[PDB]
Design a protein around this ligand. Structure first.
Ligand code: COA
Ligand code: COA
Lengths: 427, 427
């Protein structure tokens, strides 16, 4: 049974945040109708195409399980069609610029009038009421606005963006929670709501641990687990010691633990020609005895200045450079095995080539081969939530306006009226 | 009113992913009962305490809108209590080791007998059926497993962890989608399901954009939007040149645009001294004339070496370098306002200090002061989704076992039976 079987989604989205949300609703069984610009459609179609005149992978990987209709909404008749579509919809999703949908006349107040059951769901860069409410935002702008960039990277480098789509897809996933929450509200009230997710807010929610850190820092002057609190280890630009003397905002800690336990990122065989031949190594509180076995160093058991958290930070990074020579003659996976006999959260850095073709991930339906007979098959990420009673069936992305007529006929429009809308350049 | 009003959650979780998920359900009105170990409780209580004897900000910021019972599940009397609680619950959420709830005599199969309505939701490190199914994993190991570390950072540095909790909180937010999807299945079938989110999978979902890049790289040999595509721009740590001639796995791209339009992290006034004195500036394809106006390069408007994306591939990092030059005497807010005039996607790197005291974020309920009379007030991140007909009411995290007797009394137990359980050391 598919969770969102029977849910009609009127999908006005483009780029990533919005499309990611409705695609995933589609994977869970929603009937998604993507509305697009005439001629060029969603800007992802033409964005970094790998073949001329063929929809890009940006588009196909975010628009499976959708049908497409073209529509000029800057048109009297196009507005009319939208009203009809809103009357059949359970949820309408949009991620156009601030005020864009309002300017077309589709304010929340008006949408409620058209259909008291419909949920409007929107992604914006900043929350409504925010000073930067009206700004247009892509991915890394939101990473910066939400605290992630400031706390990511090294103490002697710039704010650093995550390769993960903290701004875009992460927002779409948060919107999905909001929409689903709203559907649960509606079971109770019989009424739709507006839900919105700001990209800044979705990023900040993942950066909660760093707001923890900010308060700890404000209250105590120190973050004891951060590299900067370890004696003459971190150094700034000029050959100087760093410390928390003179740091009042959570700093970048390179490859330290974050919201997990303390660890570091360690080189393995072939690192010079293989950018991803590394493991990460968590040295936690719960499992310190089990860690001292692979290092063939039992001297750290009796020592009070090694086996406690507070009696360990003073030389936290000395322990890490130790092992990096001990991993020097072993690949990622062999280093991982060599230690994993002990129940240590220790893992390889997986490369995109390894993940894309990993048999495990394809077996569990997390990386999925989409059968696309028009364009040729491509991989995608499937549903990251696995259910005992249901499996997603992922189905190729629509050609531009491929379902236009089929959608217009479902609305009750006759064959002659369909030709008029075509010739008036509305569809 | 509230989305999850009337939903009872049996919350066995600890640390981050699981507690983030049940806290957010709590913020949306769920009745959340956190089951904790006698004596110690959730390990976050004692981790990174800012005052000793007082529950850490790690715990309070992940455990608002919850009640706490102490319960030794290993005793037989604690198992019969669990059976009564399961029969009243709509959802059970656990992390623990990959097969820990099963060991305790509460397998999915048994749970269904007790309550055919209940949803069992789990966070694990890797998906069931994966080779690494059995592994314990923390934040940074999960980032490594899901492709984020490989594609985050710079081409001349190591895989870099993201400060955002891609593995932990991100997994809990994905599980919440999962739980809410399962609650919608249940409206249709009257039956609960098992839902599970592997941390690797939640990470990979956000790294979907990089699986797009991996395929583009395999198909075409080049990622034209990456710095490495500029001839003679990028070099490894030993000074060897880095081009796409030799790259077979999606590389680290520094502060390139991701799923956004091309951009970079540019220095503003004070950057040598202020770690966060930067903006993200986007060079979108539709905005070249405007950029040329902003930086006074009218000669670049009609020049094909500059006026398309394709023409900029060989020189984009040089254009960013020159743009940056215009910001040397302006702070990040002045640069943002200046770029806003032109409609350019551009914002500041907000520091955690700035975010913690930002008036906009408090006004919209995204940074919230929690009233906590026991520990003193603290900030937290509130609900990142804003609704037209409901507001969260965030209440302080429970003291260990604060609500044990209150909870045993809602089950129906009388004063004498609760007296005996305290004596037996079950609760
Ligand atoms: C991504 C973003 C920056 C791109 O902005 P953009 O390319 O300038 O396009 P916009 O969304 O602002 O749309 C431009 C106009 O086209 C209009 N439009 C969109 N589809 C149309 C169609 N089918 N027919 C007629 N007009 C249409 C919009 O209503 C808007 O009108 P306006 O001039 O009244 O504002 C912007 O859409 C945005 O800030 N989105 C919100 C946050 C977000 O999701 N961004 C990350 C990308 S997923
Ligand atoms: C985070 C993690 C690595 C911590 O692991 P840990 O420190 O080794 O603790 P565990 O979860 O393995 O629990 C240890 C044992 O205590 C038991 N236990 C937990 N609560 C108990 C209680 N209240 N009373 C009695 N026993 C209890 C567990 O059942 C487990 O039993 P086991 O030895 O048979 O496996 C692990 O819980 C995990 O990988 N979680 C799943 C995914 C996840 O959320 N991880 C990221 C952390 S948020």
């Amino acid at each position: 049974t598919k969770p969102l079987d029977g849910i009609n989604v009127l999908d006005f989205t483009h780029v990533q945040a919005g499309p990611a949300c409705t695609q995933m609703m589609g994977f869970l069984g929603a009937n998604v109708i993507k509305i697009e610009r005439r001629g060029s459609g969603d800007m992802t179609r033409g964005w970094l195409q790998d073949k001329p005149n063929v929809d890009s992978l940006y588009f196909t990987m975010f628009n499976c399980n959708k049908r497409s209709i073209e529509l000029d909404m800057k048109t009297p008749e196009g507005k009319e069609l939208l009203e009809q579509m809103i009357k059949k919809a359970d949820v309408m999703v949009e991620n156009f610029g601030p005020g864009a949908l309002d300017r077309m006349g589709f304010t929340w107040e008006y949408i409620q009038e058209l259909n008291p059951r419909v949920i409007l769901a929107s992604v914006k860069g900043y929350a409504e009421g925010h000073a930067n409410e009206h700004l247009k935002v892509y991915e890394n702008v939101a990473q910066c606005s939400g605290g992630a960039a400031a706390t990511t990277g090294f103490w002697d480098g710039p704010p650093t963006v995550s390769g993960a789509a903290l701004g875009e897809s992460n927002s779409g996933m948060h919107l999905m929670i909001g929409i689903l929450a709203a559907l649960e509200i509606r079971h109770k009230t019989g009424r739709g709501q507006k839900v919105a997710v700001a990209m800044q807010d979705a990023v900040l929610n993942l950066v909660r641990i760093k707001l923890r850190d900010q308060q700890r820092l404000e209250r105590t002057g120190i973050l004891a687990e951060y590299p900067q609190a370890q004696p003459n280890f971190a150094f700034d630009r000029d050959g100087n010691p760093l410390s928390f003397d003179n740091i009042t905002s959570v700093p970048r800690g390179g490859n330290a633990g974050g919201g997990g336990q303390p660890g570091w990122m360690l080189k393995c065989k072939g690192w010079e020609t293989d950018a991803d031949s590394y493991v990460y190594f968590t040295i936690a509180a719960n499992m310190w005895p089990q860690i001292c076995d692979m290092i063939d160093k039992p001297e750290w058991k009796d020592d009070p200045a090694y086996n406690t958290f507070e009696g360990r930070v003073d030389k936290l990074m000395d322990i890490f450079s130790f092992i990096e020579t001990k991993f020097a003659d072993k690949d990622k996976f062999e280093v991982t095995e060599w230690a994993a006999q002990y129940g240590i959260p220790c893992g390889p850095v997986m490369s995109m080539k390894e993940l894309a073709h990993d048999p495990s991930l394809q077996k569990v339906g997390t990386v999925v081969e989409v059968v696309d007979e028009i364009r040729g098959n491509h991989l995608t990420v499937g549903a990251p939530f696995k259910f005992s009673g249901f499996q997603p069936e992922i189905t190729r992305a629509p050609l531009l306006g491929e379902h236009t007529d089929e959608v217009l006929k479902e609305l009750g429009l006759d064959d002659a009226k369909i030709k008029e809308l075509h010739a008036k350049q509305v569809v």
